Design a binder for this molecule. Structure first.
Ligand code: A1BOY
Ligand code: ZN
Length: 139
């Protein structure tokens, strides 16, 4: 699990969104596994506005942060699950590293800020949903 808190916005994995997230829906994209909901309290996470291909992610299944090299956001084929049938997920970045389903929501960060959140895994590859192109999260 895990979310990004910025301004009056909360960003979560779309497959993990709650009834309160859907009741205060701002934007959601199934193709991206992303959902943004509105909040009463103000968030203070910083979003990165860059094209860094290195960073650090939080892995709840090991209680560890890991440095990773990751690909640029792209259309990557994602196997079927209880949440989605087999599809291409857009704005996806892959890295060689450990992940388990419950690690979805863990933040990926560079020197500039929050890059995205864990959203896929398997075969020793972890996939992160990019958020750097969502310029509106800051206004
Ligand atoms: C980080 O997740 C994993 N890591 C290792 C093994 C397995 C996983 C689970 C995983 O990839 N997904 C399940 C939940 C929805 C996902 C999606 N965006 O379509 C796919
Ligand atoms: Zn950066």
């Amino acid at each position: 699990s895990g979310a990004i808190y910025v301004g009056n916005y909360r960003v979560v994995n779309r497959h993990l969104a709650t009834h309160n997230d859907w009741a205060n829906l701002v934007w959601e994209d199934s193709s991206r596994d992303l959902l943004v909901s509105s909040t009463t309290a103000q968030g203070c996470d910083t979003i990165a506005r860059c094209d860094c291909q290195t960073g650090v992610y939080y892995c709840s299944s090991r209680r560890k942060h890991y440095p990773v090299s990751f690909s640029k956001p792209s259309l990557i084929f994602v196997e079927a699950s209880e949440y989605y049938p087999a599809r291409y997920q857009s704005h996806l970045m892959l890295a060689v590293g450990h992940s388990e389903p419950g690690d979805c929501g863990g933040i990926l960060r560079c020197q500039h800020g929050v890059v995205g959140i864990v959203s896929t895994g398997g075969n020793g590859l972890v996939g992160f949903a990019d958020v750097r192109d969502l310029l509106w999260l800051d206004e």
